[PDB]
């Protein structure tokens, strides 16, 4: 959706994205190591680790620290946060590619680009492990599935996979049947970097730029020093696996797996990033945007962001389905991600994306609408523009890939989008790649109606009709004469107080509160182009207010119920078991505590008992007497 | 968290002062993290209540005085990243950049001889203007309101008449706390039955040295101009 910030500079060999933070820590072979905790578009520190080049970047594994490597040959761990050096050893005859931190007796592993990597005890001083099996110049060193099992990629044209021990390398085994590492149709070669038949895999492909692992798995996704970046699965080991990854023009420095995405991202040198599948695999497309020279690609293990690294420089782009679809079922919120997965009600520790049988932020959505029941939803998938998509409508009791056409809380059919329209029971369905009207008394509805064909606006987006009408326009099932349009506007959604009758309105930036239909009760505006505020039902105004979560207003009252928890936005109100959202994370299930309602009523009847009883007692937070306690 | 901390800013007389409620409704003077000092703008933040316990079920007032005449930091409009840290009974915290730091307030009214003024008006940093047009009021009440809001000066009247129309252009001057003088001529229609003014279509000409603050001021005032849901 947006590439938040972008200047091309840096000639980048090594890279990492913060699995915890939206940092990028970047290694240039300018000799530079940089941590920028990328969030606030600001570098925390920048040390050009030595005069010579810098190849390596790896995680310590903790929260915010770098373990770093230069042509110094030195393993440094320095905490940005603590701006200090943790324990120190230099390095052999080449730089350090991967590191891991362990702790029987706060104990340490260091992975290196030369010769050996040594694993050291500073407590009850003994040897956990010795790794020989590297030579010089490691492009991409890796922890395996078993984290402390590993792979390395070399400019010595080998790959090393090692076995470790608590008293140096060894494994005991005797049950298997054939091997995929090497044992049936196809398979790729051993290299030489070490000397024990674990597997030294052949890193010859003019040398290997990157190696990347498959967690439980031994598939590797690779950057290679050949146009050929050749993919091999050692969880298969295909033939036409002797695949050379092809640009149009030269190279494929890297091509990578994204933890989450069952895909390959390739990047190259004709000025390009090239786009690849890996779910059913195939070169999708090539994308060109300069830099005829790169060596890294990355997708966050935080998965926050995604980015591609190059010689001439770098780019980070940010994703969103700015604003994205919903359904309500008792004391529960449904979301469809702008970015981010579920978060479809209730919470438990830090942030929880709601994973349920009512998969919300997940599918390939054109549109999502509750089909009210505490037991039903209607859903369009395959999203997008087509002739038409599929909608598979699902039961809250148990959703499915497509639920039963037999069942009418499961039905699927074909159709592109389904959309509400005003004077509430007519609907739009698109079941042609254009204007079908959908109209039903029921809102378990899936109805098809070409009459009301009326283009003069060709298939696009609106929801009480607004192909940017800038009005919500009311109709029946055919007509060639407007009933009427009212000039008011939407988020491109109209908010109903649960089902399909909310005179509480969304607007994209701003949202307006109405009672049902246009009665502009009050009109909301804020100016942060991000969050939410919530209604319980028709116009119950909850507003989020910092680490404080607030009722904007009730009866004649205003109140702080309970207090927020870093950013949250009120989305809306699912029952008493309260639900809150920052956008799609930074979330709540919540024991309530209203303030105000009770209050202007209470107040109105002079009544205090409650407040008192709560023993609730502010008046200042900046102030807080100023609702009317000032007045 | 039990520990709920709520905070807002109070700027009480020069001093922008930090109301903090850290309420530690914690189950103990839970360990607390870390905080860091800094030069600020013509201010510097300057206090921290020392301890780092998040005393159980307990409420606390944590005060930050800020130093309001020094610390240049040129991160305009403030909006500078600030840290409360995750450094102890805390895994995270809040890192925040501020927003909420605006102009209309800062500048005080200030004054001039008109001929010289005109000469000057023209002379000044021309480079910013914003338009006045639209509201909820007559520029009598409206003007007064705006004036008070920014705490700034309109230098002089000619009786021509801010009433029957007027077809008056109002010259305004102000000087701030860190001393910029800002000049305006806004020329405006003005309310009155089937005569003219319930919009303006008056142009607010803003001169302030940097265009960036200056225009921004024109905006700021634009925010100021009307009265609606922030």
CA distance A61 to chain B (A): 15
Chain B residues closer than 8 Å to A623 by CB: 8, 10
Pick among B1, B2, B4, B82 to test the A interface (most A CBs inside 10 A): B4
In which residue are the tokens 């940089």 written? A34
Contact B19 A526 (CB under 8 A): no
Q: Let me know the angle formed at the C-alpha of A573 by A568 and A575, rounded to the nearest 5 degrees.
A: 130
B229 closest CB neighbour out of A523, A548, A618: A523
Check B95 against A527: CB less than 8 A apart.
Answer: no
Question: Comparing C-alpha atoms, which of A127, A131, A135, A181 is closest to residue A156?
Answer: A135
User: For residues B64 and A93, what is the distance between their CA atoms, to the nearest angstrom?
Assistant: 52
Judge contact between A32 and A9, C-beta under 8 A: no
* E strand or H helix that includes residue B220: helix B211-225
Q: A94 — phi, psi (to 5°)? A: -160, 175
CA dist A81 and B93 (Å) reads 13
3-state secondary structure of A162: strand
Residue contact A547–B7, C-beta within 8 A: yes
Interface contact B8-A622, CB threshold 8 A: yes
Query: By the CB < 8 Å criterion, does B5 face chain A?
Result: yes
Q: Which of B4, B5, B6 to mutate to test the interface with A (most CBs of A within 10 A)?
A: B6
By CB atoms closer than 10 A (0-12, 13-18, 19+), residue A565 is buried
Q: How far apart are CA A403 and CA A390, in angstroms?
A: 12
CB atoms within 10 A of CB B165: 16
Q: How far apart are CA A280 and CA A264, in angstroms?
A: 11
Any CB–CB contact under 8 A between B1 and chain A?
yes
* A123 Cβ contact list (under 8 Å, min separation 6): A105, A106, A107
Residue B8: Cβ within 10 Å count: 17
User: What's CA B155's distance to the chain center, in Å?
Assistant: 22
β-bridge mates for residue A414, sequence order: A390
Q: Are B189 and B167 in contact (CB under 8 A)?
A: yes
Distance from CA of A110 to the nearest CA of B (A): 26
Phi-psi region at B186: left, alpha or beta (left = phi > 0; alpha = psi -120 to 50): beta
Helix axes B211-225, B141-150, angle to 10 degrees: 130
Interface test with chain B among A23, A82, A548, by most B beta carbons within 10 Å: A548
φ/ψ of A246, rounded to 5, equals: -120, 135
CB atoms within 10 A of CB A233: 18
Asked if A568 and A580 count as a contact pair (C-beta separation under 8 A), the reply is yes
| DSSP conformation letters of A193-217 | SSSSSSEEEE--SSS-SEEEEETTE
Question: Which residues in chain B are contacts of A622 at CB distance < 8 A?
Answer: 7-10, 19
Cα A51–Cα A54–Cα A58 angle in degrees, nearest 5? 140
The answer to whether A278 and A270 are in contact (CB under 8 A) is no
A626 touches B: beta carbon within 8 Å: no
User: Is the sign of the CA dihedral A508, A514, A518, A520 positive or negative?
Assistant: negative
Exposure string (b/e) for A343-352, b if CB count within 10 Å is 16 or more? Answer: bbbbbeeebb
Task: Please name the residue that has the structure tokens 């059913």.
Answer: A280
Which of A547, A561, A565, A595 to mutate: most B Cβ within 10 Å? A547
Encoded tokens for B77 = 């409009």
Q: In A, which residues are within 8 Å of B92 by CB distance?
A: 566
* B41/B103 Cα distance (integer angstroms): 14
- Which string of DSSP letters, residue by residue, matches A347-396? --SS-----STT--SSS-EEEEEE-SSSSEEEEEES-SSSS-EEEEEEET
Q: Are the C-beta atoms of B225 and B146 separated by less than 8 Å?
A: yes
Q: Extract the tokens encoding B90.
A: 């805390």
* Contact state of B19 with A620 under an 8 Å Cβ cutoff: yes
Per-residue three-class SS string for A398-409: ECCCCCCCCCCC
Contact of B112 with chain A, judged by CB distance below 8 Å, is answered with no
**Closest to B6 (Cβ–Cβ): which among A525, A527, A547?**
A547
Mutate: best of A44, A544, A545, A622, partner B, most B CBs <10 A:
A622
Residues of B in contact with A546 (CB under 8 A): 6-8
Environment class of residue B128 by beta-carbon count within 10 Å: exposed (0-12), middle (13-18) or buried (19+)? buried
CB hemisphere CA count around A345 (13 angstroms): 21
Nearest to B6 among A524, A526, A563 (CB): A563
Asked if B6 reaches chain A (Cβ–Cβ under 8 Å), the answer is: yes
Largest CA distance in chain B: 70
The span from the CA of A231 to the CA of A233, in Å, is 7
- Among candidates B110, B70, B98, B87, which has minimal Cα distance to B30? B87
Q: Chain B residue closest to A349 (CA)?
A: B1
Residue burial A570-588, b: 16+ Cβ < 10 Å; e: rest: bbbbbeeebbbbbbbbbbb
Distance from CA of A527 to the nearest CA of B (A): 7
Q: Which residue of A has its CA nearest to B23?
A: A563
Q: Which residues of A170-206 are buried (b: 16+ CB within 10 A; e: fewer)?
A: eeeeeeeeeebbbeeebbbebbbbbeeebbbbbbbbe
SS percent in chain B: helix, strand, coil, step 5: 15, 30, 55
| Chain mean position to CA A208 | 30
Query: For an interface test with B, which of A563, A586, A595, A619 has the most B Cβ atoms less than 10 Å from its Cβ?
Result: A563
Q: b/e for B21-59, b at 16 or more Cβ within 10 A?
A: bbbbbbeebbebbebeeeebbebbbbebeeebbbbeebb
Q: Are A525 and B230 a contacting pair at CB < 8 A?
A: yes
Q: Tell whether A175 lies on the interface with B, counting CB pairs under 8 A.
A: no
Which two tokens mark A428?
Answer: 């739009």
Nearest CA in chain B to A590: B1
Interface contact A525-B9, CB threshold 8 A: no
- A474 close to A494: Cβ distance less than 8 angstroms: no
Chain B residue at shortest CA distance from A624: B8
Interchain proximity A525–B228, CB inside 8 Å: yes
Q: What is the spatial distance between Cα A341 and Cα A446, in angstroms, rounded to a whole number?
A: 26
Residues 88-107, chain B, touching A (beta carbon < 8 A): 91-92, 94-95, 97
What are the chain A neighbours of B10 within 8 Å (beta carbons)? 622-623
Q: Do B92 and A548 touch (CB under 8 A)?
A: no
Flag whether residue B141 sits within 8 Å of chain A, measured between CB atoms. no
Lateral strand order in the sheet of A264-267: A254-257, A264-267, A272-276, A283-288
Q: A399-421 burial by CB neighbour count: b if 16+ within 10 A, else e?
A: beebbeeeeebbbbeebbbbbbb
Of B10, B81, B228, the CB nearest to A40: B81
């Amino acid at each position: 959706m947006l590439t938040k910030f972008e200047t091309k500079s840096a000639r980048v060999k090594g890279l990492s994205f913060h699995p915890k933070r939206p940092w990028i820590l970047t290694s240039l072979h300018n000799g530079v190591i940089q941590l920028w905790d990328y969030r606030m578009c600001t570098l925390i520190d920048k040390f050009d680790e030595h005069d010579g080049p810098v190849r390596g970047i790896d995680f310590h594994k903790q929260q915010p620290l770098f373990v770093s490597g230069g042509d110094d040959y030195k393993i440094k761990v320095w905490n940005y946060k603590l701006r200090r050096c943790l324990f120190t050893l230099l390095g052999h005859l080449d730089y350090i590619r991967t590191t891991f931190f362990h702790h029987e007796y706060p104990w340490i592993l260091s992975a290196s680009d030369d010769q050996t990597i040594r694993v050291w005890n500073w407590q009850s001083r003994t040897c956990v492990c010795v790794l020989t099996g590297h030579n010089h110049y490691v492009m991409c060193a890796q922890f395996h599935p078993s984290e402390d099992l590993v792979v390395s990629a070399s400019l010595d044209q080998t790959v090393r996979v090692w076995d470790i021990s608590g008293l140096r390398k060894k494994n005991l085994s005797p049950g298997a049947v054939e091997s995929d590492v090497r044992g049936i149709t196809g398979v790729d070669l051993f290299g030489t970097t070490d000397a024990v038949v674990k597997h030294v895999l052949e890193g010859h492909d003019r040398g290997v730029n990157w190696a990347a692992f498959h967690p439980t798995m031994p598939l590797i996704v690779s950057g290679a020093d050949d146009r050929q970046v050749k993919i091999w699965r050692m969880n298969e080991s295909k033939a036409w696996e002797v695949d050379t990854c092809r640009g149009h023009y030269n190279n494929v420095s890297c091509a990578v797996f994204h933890p989450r995405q069952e895909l390959i991202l390739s990047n190259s040198e004709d000025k390009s990033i090239r786009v690849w599948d890996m779910s059913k695999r195939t070169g999708v497309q090539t994308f060109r945007r300069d830099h005829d020279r790169f060596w890294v690609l990355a997708a966050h293990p935080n998965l926050n962001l995604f980015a591609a690294g190059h010689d001439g420089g770098m780019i980070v782009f940010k994703l969103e389905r700015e604003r994205p679809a919903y359904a309500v079922h008792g004391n529960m919120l449904h979301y469809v991600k702008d970015r981010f997965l579920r978060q479809l009600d209730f919470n438990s520790s830090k942030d929880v994306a709601v994973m349920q049988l009512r998969s919300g932020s997940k599918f390939p959505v054109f549109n999502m609408s509750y089909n009210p029941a505490e037991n039903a939803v209607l859903l369009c998938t395959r999203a997008s523009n087509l002739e038409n998509s599929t909608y598979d409508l699902y039961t809250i009791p148990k959703d499915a890939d497509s639920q039963n056409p037999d069942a009418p809380e499961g039905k699927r059919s074909s159709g592109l989008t389904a959309v509400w329209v005003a004077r509430n029971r007519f609907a739009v369905l698109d079941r042609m790649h254009s204007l079908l009207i959908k109209n039903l008394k029921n809102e378990i509805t899936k109805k098809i109606q070409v009459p009301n064909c009326d283009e003069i606006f060709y298939a696009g987006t609106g929801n009480l009709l607004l192909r940017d009408a800038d009005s919500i326009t009311l109709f029946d099932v055919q007509q060639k004469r407007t009933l009427a349009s009212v000039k008011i506007s939407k988020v491109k959604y109209v908010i109903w107080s649960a089902d399909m009758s909310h005179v509480a309105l969304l607007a994209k930036h701003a949202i307006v509160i109405c009672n049902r239909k246009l009665d502009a009760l009050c009109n909301i505006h804020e100016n942060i182009r991000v969050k939410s505020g919530a209604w319980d039902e028709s116009g119950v105004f909850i507003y989020t207010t910092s680490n404080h979560i607030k009722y904007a207003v009730t009866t004649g009252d205003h109140g702080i119920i309970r207090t927020l928890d870093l950013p949250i936005y009120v989305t809306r109100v699912k029952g008493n078991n309260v639900y809150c959202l920052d956008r799609e994370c930074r979330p709540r299930v919540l024991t309530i505590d209203p303030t105000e309602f009770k209050f202007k009523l209470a107040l109105i009847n002079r009544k205090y008992d409650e407040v008192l009883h709560m023993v609730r007692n502010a008046k200042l937070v900046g102030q807080s007497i100023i609702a009317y306690l000032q007045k | 968290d039990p520990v709920y901390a709520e905070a807002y800013v109070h700027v009480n007389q020069y001093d922008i002062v930090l109301d903090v409620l850290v309420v530690n409704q914690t189950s103990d003077t839970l360990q607390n993290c870390t905080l860091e000092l800094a030069t600020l703008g013509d201010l510097k933040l300057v206090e921290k209540p020392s301890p780092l316990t998040l005393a159980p079920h307990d409420f606390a007032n944590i005060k930050a005085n800020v130093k309001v005449a020094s610390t240049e930091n040129g991160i305009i409009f403030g909006n500078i990243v600030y840290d409360v840290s995750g450094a102890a009974s805390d895994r995270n915290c809040v890192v925040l950049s501020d927003i909420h730091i605006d102009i209309m307030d800062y500048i005080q009214p200030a004054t001039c001889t008109d001929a010289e003024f005109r000469q000057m008006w023209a002379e000044f940093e021309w480079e910013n203007k914003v338009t006045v047009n639209t509201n909820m009021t007559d520029l009598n009440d409206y003007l007064q309101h705006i004036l008070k809001s920014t705490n700034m000066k309109c230098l002089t009247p000619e009786k021509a008449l801010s009433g029957y129309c007027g077809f008056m252009a109002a010259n305004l001057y102000a000087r701030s706390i860190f001393g910029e003088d800002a000049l305006a001529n806004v020329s405006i229609e003005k309310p009155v039955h089937q005569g003219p003014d319930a919009a303006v279509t008056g142009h607010i000409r803003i001169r302030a040295k940097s265009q960036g603050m200056a225009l921004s001021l024109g905006d700021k005032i634009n925010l100021s101009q009307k009265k609606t849901s922030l």
